[PDB]
Amino acid sequence: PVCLVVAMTPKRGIGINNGLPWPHLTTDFKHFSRVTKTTPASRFNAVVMGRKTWESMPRKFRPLVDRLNIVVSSSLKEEDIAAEKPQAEGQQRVRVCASLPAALSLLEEEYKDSVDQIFVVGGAGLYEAALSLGVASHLYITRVAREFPCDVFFPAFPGDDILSNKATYRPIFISKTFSDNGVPYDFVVLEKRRSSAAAIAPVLAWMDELIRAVPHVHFRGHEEFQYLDLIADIINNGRTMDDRTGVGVISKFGCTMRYSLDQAFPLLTTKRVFWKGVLEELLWFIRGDTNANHLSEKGVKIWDKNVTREFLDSRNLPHREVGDIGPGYGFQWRHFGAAYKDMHTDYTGQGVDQLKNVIQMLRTNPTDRRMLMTAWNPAALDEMALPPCHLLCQFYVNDQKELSCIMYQRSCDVGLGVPFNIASYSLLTLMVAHVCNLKPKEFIHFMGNTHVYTNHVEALKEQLRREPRPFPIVNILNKERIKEIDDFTAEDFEVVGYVPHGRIQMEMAV
Template sequence: MLQFFSGLLRSSFLFRPPKCLTLPHQLHLKRLKTRLKIQLSLSDDYPHSIMDYQTENKENIYCNIHTCEKEYLNAIDYIIKHGSRRSNRTGTDTLSVFGMQMRYNIREAFPLFTTKRVFWRGILEEMLWFIRGSTNSNELKDKNVHIWDANGSRSFLDNLGFFEREEGDLGPVYGFQWRHFGAEYTDFKSEYGKTGVDQLHNVIDLIKNNPNDRRIIMSAWNPMDLPKMALPPCHVMCQFYVNNGELSCQMYQRSADMGLGVPFNVASYSLLTYMIAHITDLKPGDFIHTLGDAHVYVNHIEPLKIQLQRALHPLPTLKINRKVTDIDDFKINDFEIINYKPHGKIQMDMAV
């Protein structure tokens, strides 16, 4: 494919448009030539161009099962080399690129990255917490999972003006939107029953009964509720796709912390895909991760350079230990990660 485009660029047709073409057509060809030049120049350094996927060999369209992590590492390397330095609400600058996409083959391996140890139990507990519709960060804290502690702290809530809100009450964040979209949020102790739209239930129902539907979507982005949230959703929405007995998921993430957040997010939505595939009698297919503002915090650059030097290990597999038919019936002991042999932990501080 690269040779095709290279030949096309060298052709006299692109460099010297025929005189019979009108000016608008000539301008269009000039723009096409520029775009192709940019695409070709990026293809050597940036592995996420369409050229990586447009191939006649289907096995090469998807990353090798045990080297999918390389896509993530390549993205980090590209951001460090080419990202724009930007300020943000946290006070810690980032190097940022807008618009990236990575595809993970989750058919036979699970994308729990190996170049540093990823907190699997935290991923699992958080996903079950989302599914319960909970917005109480204390529930995770009590299980020794502290990923939401800072956003639910008294000082953080007070800084946002939530003086009357109890510590740990995050507002109508992910789980509430997944299970009660549109309902009126009061606090984390209230019972919401069947109020609002249960998007997760609707997704599963569509996968079972109308698998070709192009509207199998779940969104955490509710503009009416954003002012009530301790943190607006970073992973905004996901769409599911059924084909040849496989379930794939694409997630759009508006803000992607490549060092800390993205390894968590990749495993989290891959886990959700496994869970939904299990209860709908499908097999997991692909997880496609689409990023808006993909960034590396400047205080993560050196730790990430260490990670980039580490050798890839084979990815683990995920086993679901018993037959579950209802998404609400999953328990933490239902899941087993097999042959996870990562490198050691790399310390990176979270920007709040």
């Protein structure tokens, strides 16, 4: 009974020029070491590797310490390796076998009572052989989110859908996303499938009491499970209600999520998120721009259905031009309380610049607890095309110059809006962190009326069948040029290692 351990690009790439495709991934090596070395005493674990894999390792690390080293080869001889370096006391002698079945028989014959767990460590020859023999029970895969140039590949296998879009190997473990040297990765484990509290228990018994996302995944480290469990939760336990749009709603009240920003970026992978949109909208907010046609001209039509002549009239605003959101979001952000006229007016210097206040406070007095920005203006609500959903955000600096952000959202379209909102404010945190010389730490999402529309239910149930991929990294390009929040452009950002599942069509409740 054998276990395989691999690091892999989304296209199954494992190596190039008898070396690793990526820069050093320290956490991955910690992982490789820990899994292969650990045992309950008398016994040790075995690592079976191909000849080139052996030769790819640098001298000082070979043989792998505290593990029996077996090299599958026909050219290399046991004495070749012995002559390579003197065998350290207490360590096992490096054995060589002609094939994998040979290496397994050697383990059975001379190493019973001596070895615990057998690990196939590479390369493509041994991985393919172990899969052909079907002797592999578990796969320890490190999913390198980025694609690199590779000449050697891990073989295709049933269940390789965990890497990229297309007896089975099903994920039973998915971790949160890590990152080393600008490379995002996570860890999955696949499986071959084909009177103490006893007396307390009866009171427990009478007090005690359907849809789950990828139920087989037992360890749910990936931070996207928050969102997937949130959808299930609302469908399971939510209340069917009437709604402004006329479309049905299953709603919940006061839900919550939080996402790390220090390793990777929470751009949801279980469906493709329109990143061009979030970026272009966020920048639009930051200008204090209130013309939806500027977004519409860039291919970002997210506000068009809510700025039509028809919708502006149902809002009792016949004096609004097509594309005028009124003084919402960006306007209150940069010009709180200023008297609105139209989208074409210059409001420079009017009202309160909340964003500039927050940023200056972050830069001088980061322990202040009044670092808040609100879009909710009860005086101007009837002038907006739609009252803001994400209406407030608060900032917080800790011991280690690490920035976190809370955003309150009164109304959350789980299916369509939520993934977008997570990305939009997580980006804002990165931007503010850079400008104030801070490290981004965490985005915290506080949700009011949290709902899925009835016409989304079927699509979301399909989405729950997909296991999340590692999160991407978002890099700020041109860091030296950008010094203020108004310096960011649409070309100052790089999404690296984004490998989502396919787009899912969901109609915007108008």
